[PDB]
Design a protein around this nucleic acid. Structure first.
Length: 258
DNA sequence: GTCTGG
DNA sequence: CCAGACGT
DNA sequence: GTCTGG
DNA sequence: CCAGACGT
């Protein structure tokens, strides 16, 4: 799970993230670094994607059930990394297996500080391996949706964003600069629905109960939080063209059916 | 910064 | 103890 | 075969 | 994730 779509204009994304805090107040998440939001049909690791995180990570004495939305770097850069440039990292932090997460140096420390985030996406791409061919079929995978320029605009207004369990860390560049916020997406075993595409899938949080508990490092311990991490069958997909393959291709044809 | 392997 | 990794 | 850049 | 380089 090393590609996503996140193409929505920023205000349309923000209205799709309407939530209720613990007191039942209908809110929209507050932005940090909105200028780093770069919408694209074709997001790879080392790009920025919007994530939800608890207000309490940014504001002292905050309601931990309130939400911030911020761009973060896809590919976790641990706090301790010593080189000048994030891209010199000699290990893969695009994903984080759920089974091993407590034993992994890169993920344990930040998960232990409550650095739990929710990665937003239209949906994600997976490439299917088939016996005795090097050819790979790309699929676009997304939450079931409520079933022409008027058809398109209506669908994307009423789109249910995919909400994926992530962990994030903060890194002060040694040479100097703004603190880097970076995230990994947690993986689990694929469900029956997806098993013929790929043996591994992102940890999907299905519904506002699950999203809220994962965000709320105020009231919800790591042990309680890890119980939300599992496959889901509440998932659909269709085959897409080879246009997605090259990350430089940012167009609607990326997630168009064939 | 922390932890495993030697 | 220190060296060396730290991940999919 | 492996790794960086996108 | 895949594309594309891989060197003086």
């Amino acid at each position: 799970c090393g590609r996503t779509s996140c193409h929505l204009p920023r205000d349309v994304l923000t209205r799709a993230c309407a939530y209720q805090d613990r007191r039942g107040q209908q809110r929209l998440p507050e932005w940090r670094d909105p200028d780093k939001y770069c919408p694209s049909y074709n997001k790879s690791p080392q790009s920025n994607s919007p994530v939800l995180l608890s207000r309490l990570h940014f504001e002292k004495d905050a309601d931990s059930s309130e939400r911030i939305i911020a761009p973060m770097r896809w590919g976790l850069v641990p706090s301790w990394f010593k080189e000048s440039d994030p891209s010199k990292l000699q290990f893969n932090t695009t994903n984080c297996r759920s089974d091993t997460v407590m034993e992994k140096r890169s993920f344990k420390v930040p998960l232990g500080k409550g650095r739990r985030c929710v990665v937003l996406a239209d949906g994600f791409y997976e490439w299917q391996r088939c016996q005795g061919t090097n050819q790979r079929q790309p699929y676009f995978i997304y939450f079931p949706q409520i079933k022409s320029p008027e058809n398109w605009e209506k669908v994307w207004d009423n789109w249910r964003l995919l909400t994926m369990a992530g962990i994030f860390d903060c890194w002060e560049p040694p040479e100097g600069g703004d603190v880097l916020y970076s995230y990994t997406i947690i993986t689990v075993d694929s469900c029956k629905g997806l098993s013929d595409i790929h043996h591994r899938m992102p940890a999907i949080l299905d519904g506002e109960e699950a999203v809220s508990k994962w965000l709320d490092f105020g009231e919800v311990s790591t042990q309680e939080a890890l119980k939300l991490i599992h496959p889901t069958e509440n998932i659909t997909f269709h085959a897409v063209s080879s246009v997605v393959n090259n990350s430089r291709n940012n167009t609607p044809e990326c997630l168009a059916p064939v």
